[PDB]
Symmetry: D2
């Protein structure tokens, strides 16, 4: 199995597998069963922003999800990532729909990782930023249903040519380069990610969610990971 | 009185005013009496590095102080900085000697502050980096005894022309521009600082310490802030 | 007199003092009489963007001014800036109106300066970015008529409470910190600036222009610098 | 054939194929026959630094190669890179030896590419920085003889376990991710690279050189590209 750490924007409460009884954001460490969650007043049809951060000194993975003038939902979790992840990883975005559906539309995404070693200059750095997506994003590994559209958006899950979301979809986008997310001689390892997103749905209870995740480099969509497993895990353990 | 938040590298245990009984690093919020400390195996005559970070989501101010191959001392403290500091601040370095003495030599210093508001692009940013100091550092406000030397170092406290440290010294260096360190509409406010330093001393128990601090914009060295008060506070309350 | 290098967005052709006979962008080195100009299809009432760059190896100061889908005007000039400017400068924006008028509204501004010396890490850096302006921009030196408005814009020249531009106005905004724009031991010195702007006017021939400029640190608006002298020069020599 | 743009640090004058009669730096556009060269006072056994820059407004590709206190060699060339390179590229370092030999040791490498579109925020960015190299650099495509060593250096050409350079060697290292180096709607495209290097040799006339290059994404070492062709070209046309 892969090794996964994620920030989930989970629109659909799957209380049979431990979700709280509301839409929520969560921090996931090697399980769909979040280690920490917060209530999320998700707003269909409005552009949201997520900002995720972590550093190895603080050892606190945090996320905030906002809609302008609209709400600010925050979650954090204390964890030593170096003890969980391999030292080389790929970073990505995932999304699913199930019986119920929603767009999982990414409008922009940025990511920064640093390793520091007793200088004002980083010992290692990686940064990428997209404020739109090309028709042929050569620096993305697209998995499952994920595609880019004529508007420059990344559609993680399937949408029809009219823009309507489809059920039973899974898709992911990984940055092409492996990231050296920790190294045993570094003094500090830190990372930050931001993305903006648009979730539209006609459904009473839109589903299922989208995530930013960090994984082993050769990560692939697990078999059986549609709907409530957000394209990340093979089961609900 | 000024309003001060600091990371102290405190070489001299002043147990009468609450220091632990060893050299230590500490996080100071409006008092010399640190809110959190860690033991510090300080090494005279070796170049050290300090890395300080905070973000408004995590609400955890952290520092790590290292000497290569030598030791890694870390301290953190959970606090909401926006509720403590004014929204405009100056950032700086301070140092003192007292009866006992040490160089408080800064070899490099960098600082980054960001404000983010629902885009992959910062809503506001400030960054500065010095890997050496000019003879006339026009972007620094030098206070007290602080000066730059012919080697490109910032000598926060007095040193003789042979390089020997002097007692009863206080000095500070502030970045010239005010920094907008938080703002009530921002989704996230974050800052990072790094500096490298050299503390030499002939004394059995070198004193007194050096700090990175954040203050009201018009901050000045308090009267009576030499030695154990590290140039930051007018008393030990 | 001050020492000035500027990029001018010159809406009004003052052919008596050497302007071409059209609105134009220009590179100005110690004179209002541009060293290089390009025709500018300026569009009142639309948001424009300017990007300015220079590096000491290439020795080519360049600017591009764009309106989305609208036009792209570019100018460059080969010059060794280190031989013209003092090693410490302030950077700023200036604007004027004269008999004829226009808003000189700045919506965002960023600036980066680097000094490099045989490492992958900069020897010195300064960066600032504003994507809006506070009511009390403590890190700006406002000169003349320049003010910030309730919308978060910087109004370099006077506008009425209805937003109508006024004639015979001059204003400038400088970044608070001096910038070490070159240093004799650096291998490379480089700088980049971006701003976005909005020029509205009811006038047949809107006037007079706005600039990004670099000057001696103590620069002030010259006497007699309204209208065609864009707040930068005391005469048209 | 591949499509190549390079900055060459050419230690060995191959005057039969157009080199000047001295060690030199050069800018290469689709040929080994440099479009522009400068004399280079190369210093065996000393660490050097190269800084390379380009932007689409200025249209001037420049390089400077320095040894501290030692010499500063600069070359530039006016060219519109968007008309030469594909819009997606890989970036890399190459080196060769031939009959005569030298180490082609890279100690650090950084690279930044930006695309800007009428905001203070980049429309697209990629940055990477290595201040040393891992034993298994998962974000590098190593070609030919290139390897990383136990000291954290990248040895582009073969060296023995005692550190002695070998003849008839070719090697390259490419960054794993493709780079979107230009795009037809961008207002500006810019890139910067820095690396530090160490060239040791016992030979009277050390050979052959090392380069930073930009190529089509699927670039490979051409057959017959050892020695004077610096691993980049299949012939001397
Ligand atoms: O998309 C929402 C959910 O739809 C499905 O689960 C169901 C939620 N409501 C239901 C109602 C009926 C039945 Br049948 C099923 Cl499986 C479900 C499953 O696909 C879940 O994995 C998914 O989280
Ligand atoms: O520099 C170390 C310290 O020296 C002084 O306190 C003393 C430490 N040891 C002593 C021994 C004797 C006497 Br007298 C004095 Cl005040 C002290 C004071 O200046 C303190 O503020 C300072 O922390
Ligand atoms: O704002 C545009 C210009 O208005 C003035 O110059 C004039 C341009 N057209 C005119 C027409 C009449 C007279 Br009177 C005057 Cl001074 C001028 C002067 O204020 C110029 O400096 C300025 O460039
Ligand atoms: O490494 C230096 C050079 O060595 C070779 O060319 C020669 C330079 N001096 C010579 C002297 C003798 C002979 Br045989 C040969 Cl091929 C050469 C060839 O391998 C060249 O491609 C290379 O630039
Ligand atoms: Ca769920
Ligand atoms: Ca103390
Ligand atoms: Ca004019
Ligand atoms: Ca050659
Ligand atoms: Mn959940
Ligand atoms: Mn203390
Ligand atoms: Mn003009
Ligand atoms: Mn050559
Ligand atoms: Na878009
Ligand atoms: Na130094
Ligand atoms: Na605005
Ligand atoms: Na090294």
């Amino acid at each position: 199995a892969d090794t996964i750490v994620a920030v989930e924007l989970d629109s659909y409460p799957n209380t049979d597998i431990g979700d709280p009884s509301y839409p929520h954001i969560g921090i996931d460490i090697k399980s769909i069963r979040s280690k920490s969650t917060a209530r999320w007043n998700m707003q269909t049809g409005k552009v949201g922003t997520a900002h995720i951060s972590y550093n190895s000194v603080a050892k606190r993975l945090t996320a905030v999800v906002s809609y302008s003038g609209s709400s600010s939902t925050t979650v954090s979790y204390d964890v030593d990532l170096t003890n969980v992840l391999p030292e080389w990883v790929r970073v990505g975005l995932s999304a699913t729909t199930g019986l119920y559906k929603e767009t999982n539309t990414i409008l922009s995404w940025s990511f920064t990782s640093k390793l520091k070693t007793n200088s004002i200059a980083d010992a290692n750095a990686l940064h990428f930023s997209f404020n739109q997506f090309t028709q042929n994003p050569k620096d993305l590994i697209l998995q499952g249903d994920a595609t880019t559209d004529s508007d420059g958006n990344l559609e993680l899950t399937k949408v029809s040519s009219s823009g309507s979301p489809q059920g039973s979809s899974v898709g992911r986008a990984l940055f092409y380069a492996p990231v050296h997310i920790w190294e045993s001689s570094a003094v500090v390892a830190s990372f930050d990610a931001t993305f903006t997103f648009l979730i539209k749905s006609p459904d009473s209870e839109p589903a299922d969610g989208i995530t930013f995740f960090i994984a082993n480099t050769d990560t692939s969509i697990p078999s059986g990971s549609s709907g409530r497993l957000l394209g990340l895990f093979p089961d609900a353990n």
